[PDB]
């Protein structure tokens, strides 16, 4: 099968040029087409016929093609350009219509300030205990960078079973957020004095506690 | 017929900067505009055809923007070997017409010149001519002053200068200054000196030799 | 079925049909553009107009045609030949000699209003525009 | 104003059939060809099929030949993708796209897409628990309340507050994939502490795969 | 693999006829749908299109020049020529041949810009006669040494017309070479100099020869350059 090869990842600094390549045996004779897809949205054509821009695409985008390789260049890259970029090529005589593997463009915001997380810890609800179950909700939001670790404690001892924690995800204001859940039995929730949610970020700990006697 | 108005005429930008050259057609040329890069002494090289499409083997940093009569050429990040004169040409209809061109210089940090001086050869002195050469090597910017003093007499009107193309690697210039005298006048004075003034030299330099 | 008032962009022996205008697209490079213009100016037409493309025909000529685009770069408005000429009885033909597609149509009678239309032949990275103009001879 | 809307997605079992539709508006749909492109989780874009403007020609990727079929109704400006003998690897978001011209060359305009989930795992509805506010975890004078969505499969789950009338301060967190195989998430909203005894905050939850709609009221402790 | 090459005299007297010929290798003119044109560039000025010709022999001219202009084609030798009658000093330029397309108003036409060019030949229109150059060494001395590296060169004086080409050690030495543009001296003769920086330890051991060519006078000089005594 005819395929188009792309590098899986490319990362650059803002203001610099990002080059994304796409190799293919028939590209010397067939045009390449470049598509941008931001997370959660529909794809958009950014370059057609190797080097042309559709109406509405900024001049920062540009394409070239020499030999068996097409290149998509994004000058003056910004955070708004974080997306996946796919090349495409087709031939009616050969009966193929193929996308490349895709390339995820990462923008490293150079020299970035910091922000401490704000933790919100919810005790089990009055209705959940009536179902013979108990779940502690620990919400971690508004922190940068997005690389934290969460730990739970039973009065004084860590918990090594029944813990589920999310991966960090960027919010709308370019900060990170995550959450962690603790599954416990109603008897384990009343037998201990207090449960805590320990959140570590850059060596600084933010930790909150709720009591079962409420 | 169709007048191509290119601007700017000159352009100076450091390595890695974004450079845009524009071109405007008298009337509508559709999209039949091309961009040429001409190194000194060579024919122009075709870079872009039908306004937007890139010639094969051309680096990805070149791009084009087409319209009815307004056109653009852009370089995303300059390289040292990019210095040339760029022309736009319409191939829409006869007669073919070009723009005035854009001479692109790559800007760099200041570098003081290396000053050498060459006395006239004995073979040249056998005939009735004498040439003294003052050499400035690998400097930036191009603007420099060279004056000839012989026996502390400021000479004027017997020297010519020649300056090289910008170096493809270090973006520097080199300059020659040829003081021309007859053998008769050359054998009347002892000390020959050129004094060089440049932005890279905190105070002017003077290189000199004694006749013989 | 001999004379085709059109453009032959192919190269091999066109034994079946003979075209009035010929330009082999394989002889030009990617920096070139083929422009082929056909003009028809007679009181009553009985002409067989067509095209010989060694690549891809855009749009579905001649049932579909591009509205001519002066200036700009390439056409973008797809119209239908029955509405562009405003005649209700047009024959449409198609044949293929190897990898060369041939698309024809037959006009009979007079044309109400002078019109024109464009068809694109794209082979690899090269494009060839066939522009036809049919006069009303009013 | 080229507008394309896909519909017909859902959660099906492997082997099931399913027909997607794509409603087109803003352009002469009768004249352009149409593509179907899919995006599977973890993978990249994959071209599926395309059809001409009059249905003269159809093309299919070898990964779906013999199972998927494409059709169109020009009189209603609708494109159809008929999937059959569905397999687990067919789980993806399916976009319809307008071709550059009449045939199958390249896609230009895309719709928002519809999600198709093929799995032999049973669909489970969510559990909704109110996260009541109180004097605990004071956020600097205000209060933080929410609701918990627990043990649901598969995604997604949509959460709103006061039927869309309340939006300032609402934060819905991304879900977590538990060790059991089910998802869970929380949605917290911050409001002034003086409005606890006057305003009513209703947590709206909807899960389309299990047809469950639960609106739990969060009262102060 | 297409290659164009101009040929012709580089010095023509005023009011005479300037002749040039382009030779096409790697392709056939009679099979080509392209046009074959001539473009000139005066020293320090811009580009000017003269005219083109098809394998018919059909010619097209820049209107302000049709009276002095004549372009012909010889398909049996893959050549097309240029005739410029009644030349003046304004005709001193570098002349190029090139393959390009036709004009929009044509029925069946290739629209394409000049892609394949010739190397270009300078033609000086002057009443002056040819004079060969004199090559004098720019010997390296204590005054031309800096940082363990020395600089030497050759002085090419009193020649007409342009150009001259200079190489070092028969082309084997190109690193750190500066051939200056020629200047027009007070006598109406051109003069330039080529210089090169070499390591100081290699002086007296490595031989340095500048190769000067001035074809209008059939001049070839291989001047060895060595320190002064
Ligand atoms: C070449 O053909 C004839 C001469 O045989 C001429 O009238 C025609 O205009 C030419 N076609 C071109 C230059 O395209």
mmCIF file with all atom_site columns, C-alpha atoms and ligand atoms in Angstrom, chain C residues 23, chain E residues 33-35 53-60 102 106-110, ligand 1:
data_model
loop_
_atom_site.group_PDB
_atom_site.id
_atom_site.type_symbol
_atom_site.label_atom_id
_atom_site.label_alt_id
_atom_site.label_comp_id
_atom_site.label_asym_id
_atom_site.label_entity_id
_atom_site.label_seq_id
_atom_site.pdbx_PDB_ins_code
_atom_site.Cartn_x
_atom_site.Cartn_y
_atom_site.Cartn_z
_atom_site.occupancy
_atom_site.B_iso_or_equiv
_atom_site.pdbx_formal_charge
_atom_site.auth_seq_id
_atom_site.auth_comp_id
_atom_site.auth_asym_id
_atom_site.auth_atom_id
_atom_site.pdbx_PDB_model_num
ATOM   1  C CA . UNK C 1 23  ? -0.426 20.780 -27.095 1.00 0.00 ? 23  UNK C CA 1
ATOM   2  C CA . UNK E 2 33  ? 6.302  24.150 -27.470 1.00 0.00 ? 33  UNK E CA 1
ATOM   3  C CA . UNK E 2 34  ? 8.384  26.841 -25.740 1.00 0.00 ? 34  UNK E CA 1
ATOM   4  C CA . UNK E 2 35  ? 9.643  30.180 -27.017 1.00 0.00 ? 35  UNK E CA 1
ATOM   5  C CA . UNK E 2 53  ? 11.093 33.244 -31.431 1.00 0.00 ? 53  UNK E CA 1
ATOM   6  C CA . UNK E 2 54  ? 9.235  29.976 -31.994 1.00 0.00 ? 54  UNK E CA 1
ATOM   7  C CA . UNK E 2 55  ? 10.431 26.960 -33.953 1.00 0.00 ? 55  UNK E CA 1
ATOM   8  C CA . UNK E 2 56  ? 8.224  28.327 -36.739 1.00 0.00 ? 56  UNK E CA 1
ATOM   9  C CA . UNK E 2 57  ? 10.564 31.224 -37.176 1.00 0.00 ? 57  UNK E CA 1
ATOM   10 C CA . UNK E 2 58  ? 7.730  33.407 -35.864 1.00 0.00 ? 58  UNK E CA 1
ATOM   11 C CA . UNK E 2 59  ? 9.235  36.330 -33.965 1.00 0.00 ? 59  UNK E CA 1
ATOM   12 C CA . UNK E 2 60  ? 7.924  38.684 -31.292 1.00 0.00 ? 60  UNK E CA 1
ATOM   13 C CA . UNK E 2 102 ? 4.353  33.027 -24.938 1.00 0.00 ? 102 UNK E CA 1
ATOM   14 C CA . UNK E 2 106 ? -2.585 33.696 -28.210 1.00 0.00 ? 106 UNK E CA 1
ATOM   15 C CA . UNK E 2 107 ? -4.933 30.847 -29.122 1.00 0.00 ? 107 UNK E CA 1
ATOM   16 C CA . UNK E 2 108 ? -2.818 27.857 -28.015 1.00 0.00 ? 108 UNK E CA 1
ATOM   17 C CA . UNK E 2 109 ? 0.121  28.979 -25.888 1.00 0.00 ? 109 UNK E CA 1
ATOM   18 C CA . UNK E 2 110 ? 2.397  27.867 -23.059 1.00 0.00 ? 110 UNK E CA 1
HETATM 19 C C1 . LIG F 3 .   ? 3.377  28.690 -35.529 1.00 0.00 ? 1   LIG F C1 1
HETATM 20 O O1 . LIG F 3 .   ? 2.584  28.271 -36.703 1.00 0.00 ? 1   LIG F O1 1
HETATM 21 C C2 . LIG F 3 .   ? 2.242  29.265 -37.686 1.00 0.00 ? 1   LIG F C2 1
HETATM 22 C C3 . LIG F 3 .   ? 3.354  29.286 -38.709 1.00 0.00 ? 1   LIG F C3 1
HETATM 23 O O2 . LIG F 3 .   ? 3.533  28.013 -39.312 1.00 0.00 ? 1   LIG F O2 1
HETATM 24 C C4 . LIG F 3 .   ? 2.005  30.616 -37.020 1.00 0.00 ? 1   LIG F C4 1
HETATM 25 O O3 . LIG F 3 .   ? 1.044  31.354 -37.765 1.00 0.00 ? 1   LIG F O3 1
HETATM 26 C C5 . LIG F 3 .   ? 1.512  30.384 -35.603 1.00 0.00 ? 1   LIG F C5 1
HETATM 27 O O4 . LIG F 3 .   ? 1.079  31.609 -35.032 1.00 0.00 ? 1   LIG F O4 1
HETATM 28 C C6 . LIG F 3 .   ? 2.637  29.796 -34.761 1.00 0.00 ? 1   LIG F C6 1
HETATM 29 N N1 . LIG F 3 .   ? 2.129  29.305 -33.490 1.00 0.00 ? 1   LIG F N1 1
HETATM 30 C C7 . LIG F 3 .   ? 2.640  29.670 -32.310 1.00 0.00 ? 1   LIG F C7 1
HETATM 31 C C8 . LIG F 3 .   ? 3.796  30.633 -32.360 1.00 0.00 ? 1   LIG F C8 1
HETATM 32 O O5 . LIG F 3 .   ? 2.190  29.242 -31.248 1.00 0.00 ? 1   LIG F O5 1
#
